[PDB]
Amino acid sequence: YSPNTQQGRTSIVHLFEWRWVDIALECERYLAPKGFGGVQVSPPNENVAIYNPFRPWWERYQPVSYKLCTRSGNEDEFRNMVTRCNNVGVRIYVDAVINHMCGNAVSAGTSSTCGSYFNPGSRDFPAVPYSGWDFNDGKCKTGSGDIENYNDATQVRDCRLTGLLDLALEKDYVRSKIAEYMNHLIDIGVAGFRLDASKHMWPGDIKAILDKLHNLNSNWFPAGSKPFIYQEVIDLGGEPIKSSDYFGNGRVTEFKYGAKLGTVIRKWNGEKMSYLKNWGEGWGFMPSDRALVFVDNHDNQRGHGAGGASILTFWDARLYKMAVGFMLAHPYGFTRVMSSYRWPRQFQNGNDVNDWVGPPNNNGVIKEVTINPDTTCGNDWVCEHRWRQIRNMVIFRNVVDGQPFTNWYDNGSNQVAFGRGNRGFIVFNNDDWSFSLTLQTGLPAGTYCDVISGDKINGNCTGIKIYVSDDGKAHFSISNSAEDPFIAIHAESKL
Numbered sequence: 001y002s003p004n005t006q007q008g009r010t011s012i013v014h015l016f017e018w019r020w021v022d023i024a025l026e027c028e029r030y031l032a033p034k035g036f037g038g039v040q041v042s043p044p045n046e047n048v049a050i051y052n053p054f055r056p057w058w059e060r061y062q063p064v065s066y067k068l069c070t071r072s073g074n075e076d077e078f079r080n081m082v083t084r085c086n087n088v089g090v091r092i093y094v095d096a097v098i099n100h101m102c103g104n105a106v107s108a109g110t111s112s113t114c115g116s117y118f119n120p121g122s123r124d125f126p127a128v129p130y131s132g133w134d135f136n137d138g139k140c141k142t143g144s145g146d147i148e149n150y151n152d153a154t155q156v157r158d159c160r161l162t163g164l165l166d167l168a169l170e171k172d173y174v175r176s177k178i179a180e181y182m183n184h185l186i187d188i189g190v191a192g193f194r195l196d197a198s199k200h201m202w203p204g205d206i207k208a209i210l211d212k213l214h215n216l217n218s219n220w221f222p223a224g225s226k227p228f229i230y231q232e233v234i235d236l237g238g239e240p241i242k243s244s245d246y247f248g249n250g251r252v253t254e255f256k257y258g259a260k261l262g263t264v265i266r267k268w269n270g271e272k273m274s275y276l277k278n279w280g281e282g283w284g285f286m287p288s289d290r291a292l293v294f295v296d297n298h299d300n301q302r303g304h305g306a307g308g309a310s311i312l313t314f315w316d317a318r319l320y321k322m323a324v325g326f327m328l329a330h331p332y333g334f335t336r337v338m339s340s341y342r343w344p345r346q347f348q349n350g351n352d353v354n355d356w357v358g359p360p361n362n363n364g365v366i367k368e369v370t371i372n373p374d375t376t377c378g379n380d381w382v383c384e385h386r387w388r389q390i391r392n393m394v395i396f397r398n399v400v401d402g403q404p405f406t407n408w409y410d411n412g413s414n415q416v417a418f419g420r421g422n423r424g425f426i427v428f429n430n431d432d433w434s435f436s437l438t439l440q441t442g443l444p445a446g447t448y449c450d451v452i453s454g455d456k457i458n459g460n461c462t463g464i465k466i467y468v469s470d471d472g473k474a475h476f477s478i479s480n481s482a483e484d485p486f487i488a489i490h491a492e493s494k495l
Ligand SMILES: OC[C@H]1O[C@H](O[C@H]2[C@H](O)[C@@H](O)[C@@H](O[C@H]3[C@H](O)[C@@H](O)[C@@H](O)O[C@@H]3CO)O[C@@H]2CO)[C@H](O)[C@@H](O)[C@@H]1O
Pocket: 124, 125, 126, 129, 130, 131, 132, 133, 134, 171, 173, 174
C-alpha cells in the first residue's frame, strides 16, 4: 500500500507514451530536483502494432508477449531508465496489462512491436507461450463471448473486455507466466505496478499472482520492501463490483475523485467549492489509505473509460490547474499527476472522433520530448508536470506531508481556503467576483511567496507576496480575472 518513494516525495507522474530514454533524462534533469516521487510508464511489454487506425495509443493495451520491446524502447533501454531513475531516487511504476492479450479479431501475423508471431484466432501466442486452454472461452457464458452487462459480476471477470482475449487467471501456469514477467521487472528495479483492468480480474486471482512476487531489488530498496500495487477499478456506484473488494491486494484507483472534483469546479448541477469542506470519505470515497487519486487519467481525458463530461484536462488549463492544486493540497489519497500529449481533438456531435490518436510521431516513431529554455516542452508534449502551478503544488504536498487539514474557510459559494497544519495554506476563488479577505493561515509570521503566480528565487518572490502577521492572519486578494485564481504558500516559500 506504500509507494516506496523516498521519504518526503508524495506524488507520481504518468509520463503517458514517453520513450524510455526521455524518461531517464527527465528523472535526472527534472523529476529528481523537483521532488517527484516516481513515474507511471506505459505498458513496457510487446503489443500489437495497429495500422488502422494509425498506431493508436490503445494498441499498447493489446499484449502480444512479455518481451520488454515497445515503441518506448527495448529491454536495454528500459533497464537503463529504471537504473538511472532509481539512482536519483525517482521510482518507476509499470502499467501491467495482465488481464488479457490482444483483440480476438486481430489478424494473425507479426504485426507486433518486436515482431513476435501471434494468432488471435487460434489463441496462439508462442512468444509467452499461451495457447487456447490459457483463455476463458469455455468459462464465459455470454452469447457474444464479450462483456455485455456490468450488472453481472461474473461475466465482467470471465468474458472479453471489448473483445480482448481473456486470460484464465485461475490457472497456476498463467499466474506463473504473469509473475515471471512482473518479477523480471521487479528484479530490474521497478517499485510497483498499476494493475490494468483490475475490475476484470477476480480479487482472489490477483492475490494469487501477487503472492508470487518478489520483494523489491535490495540494491536500491530496504529488505522486505513490497511492490506498490494500485488496481484500476472504475467504481462510480450503480454496479455490483465495488472497489473495496480489492483492498486486500493494494490500493485502488478512486475514479469518483476526479469525476466529482470536475463537477464541483465546473459548478455543474448547483455544486460549488464550499461543499468541499468534507472532501474525502464524506463524499462517498474509499478510505484515504487505499486511494490512488487523480484529476484525469489517460482514458477519461479523451472520453474513454469513465468519469464523464465533467473531467478536467489540460485543454481546460485554468480550471485544471485549480483542480490539480486542490488535489495536491488536500490530504486525501496518494496523488498521481497526469502528463499528456496534444492531439488534434475534433468534436462531432459532442464526441471527439480523434480520441484514438497516438503520441506525437514521425511515421510511427514516437517523437523525443524536447525541453524549451522556459522549461516547457516541445514536439506536442504538454508536460503538465512542468507547469509552474502544478510543479510547485507537487512540492507543496511534499512540504506539508503529514500535516492535518485545518483552518477551513468558505464564503458559502466558491471562495474557499484551508491550511495543512502550520506548514501550508491555500486559497481559491472560483466565484465571478473578487476574493479580498484577511484569513487565519495557521502559519508562522513572515513574508511568503505565492508559489502559483511565482517562485522563491535568490531570497525573493517572483510573484505575489503574502504577509502573515503575529496572529497568523494574512490578507488575500484574488480577482476572478486573475491568471490563476488561487494562491498557495508554504514553509519553504517563506522569505
Ligand atoms: O510443447 C509444444 C507446445 O508448446 C507451447 O505449449 C505451452 C502451452 O501453450 C502453455 O499453456 C503451457 O502448458 C501448460 C498448461 O497451461 C498447464 O495447465 C499444464 O497442463 O502444464 C502445461 C505444460 O507446462 O506450456 C506449454 C509448453 O510450453 C505452445 O503454446 C504450443 O503451441 C505448443 O504446441
